[PDB]
Structure 1
Amino acid sequence: STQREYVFIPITNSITIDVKITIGGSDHITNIDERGIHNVLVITGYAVDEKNGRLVPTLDPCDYVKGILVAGTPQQAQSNDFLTLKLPANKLYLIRKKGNISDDLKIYIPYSSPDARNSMKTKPVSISDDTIVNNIIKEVFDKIYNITQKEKVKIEKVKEDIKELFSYYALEQ
């Protein structure tokens, strides 16, 4: 089998340290081939809260979250806090997908408390501020695909893959 993790990409990054093994097998669903990121995942109905980075299960479908796919494990103290999910590579939602994977998935996505104490005044949050992006490049891209920025002379490509796509929804409260 093979399991993947899900690190959403907000304006900040309290989500870098999440895994034991960097690569897993040879499997990494998201594809970066000098042309843009592939096999990206968006989740209808859910939100993310910027503080103590995890997801927030909302109810309205418009509330969507755009994280990426890396192969990993939930740091060995979860599935009591994270929501394990096995889906057969055709019952999931990809965007700009590169190819096919072989229905061997167990994703460990973030999850915080649903916070049924205040109202989820969700906020449409895009990404700007190249200065916040420069380091988040290495915190997520060579963190998993360390062949980028090694031979990859595509400095602005993997930067441009985010600033116009990963516009998620957040609470900011």
Structure 2
Amino acid sequence: STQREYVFIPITNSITIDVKITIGGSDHITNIDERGIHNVLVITGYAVDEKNGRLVPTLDPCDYVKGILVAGTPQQAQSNDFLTLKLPANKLYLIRKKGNISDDLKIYIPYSSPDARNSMKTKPVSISDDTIVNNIIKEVFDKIYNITQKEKVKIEKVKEDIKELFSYYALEQ
């Protein structure tokens, strides 16, 4: 029952906070100790909506929405904005997994309504453009420790896993 959170990694300037105070502990998933970003999380079958920086589900098992599971607090306010599920840690789509963690979790996933006032489309997109990696990793994730960018000797390595791992599917609306 780890009160987990999922801050995903698009190019949008809309993933600023969307969250609040810490896990309730320090058993995190930013396993950047060895060689950079480890233990990625990819939702299957979701959009990113290119705006209103939450996630929208679309029912084809073809989409990838990626981002690191850094826990915390869902703005201390939301209950319906998330799926409120309980995973046993063995039913996910993960990348760069370490020694198996056989515990169980709490689930808050940033959710936008399907709300197909428009039509839903999938738009492939990734990260490039040094300023487009300069913005977001300094917004939030560098502050997970802030000992990163302090002594982090893998700055050249962590900077790439934004353009190497997290490739999401936009909305095209």
Give the structure-1-normalised TM-score.
0.91
Structure 2 segments unaligned to the other structure (5+ residues) = none
Q: 1:172 to 1:24 in 2, by over 3 A?
A: farther
| 106-115 vs 132-141, greater mean Cα deviation | 132-141
**Cα deviation 1:15-49 (Å, max 9, x = unaligned):** 22233323530111231124121111011111111
Offset at residue 60 of structure 1 (A): 0.9
Deviates more, 1:19-28 or 1:77-86: 19-28
What is the distance in 1 between the residues matched to 2:141 and 2:156?
13
Between 45-54 and 7-16, report the one with greater CA deviation: 7-16
How far apart are 1:159 and its partner, in Å? 0.8
Say which structure is richer in strand.
1
CA distance in 1, matches of 2:99, 2:138: 25
Aligned-residue RMSD, C-alpha: 1.7
Supply the distance in 2 between the matched residues of 1:30 and 1:92 (Cα, whole angstroms).
17
Q: Alpha-carbon deviations, 1:40-94, whole Å to 9, x = none?
A: 1011111111211000111111111001111212122212222222101112221
CA distance in 1, matches of 2:31, 2:105: 16
1:170 match: 170
Matches within 5 A, 1:18-167: 18-167=18-167
Shift of the 126–23 alpha-carbon distance from structure 1 to 2, 3 Å rule, reads same
Provide TM-score, normalisation by structure 2.
Answer: 0.91
Indicate how the Cα distance of structure 1 residues 116 and 19 shifts in structure 2: closer, same or farther if over 3 A, else same.
Answer: closer
Write the deviation string for residues 75-131 of structure 1: whole angstroms up to 9, x where unpaired: 222122222221011122210112333413112111111022222121111111111
Alpha-carbon offset, residue 148 of structure 1: 1.2
Counterparts of 1:129 and 1:34, CA distance in 2 = 26
Q: Quick check: 2:11–2:136 contact (8 Å CA) kept in 1? A: no
Give the paired residue count: 173
Gaps in structure 1 of 5+ consecutive residues: none
Quick check: 2:16–2:136 contact (8 Å CA) kept in 1? no
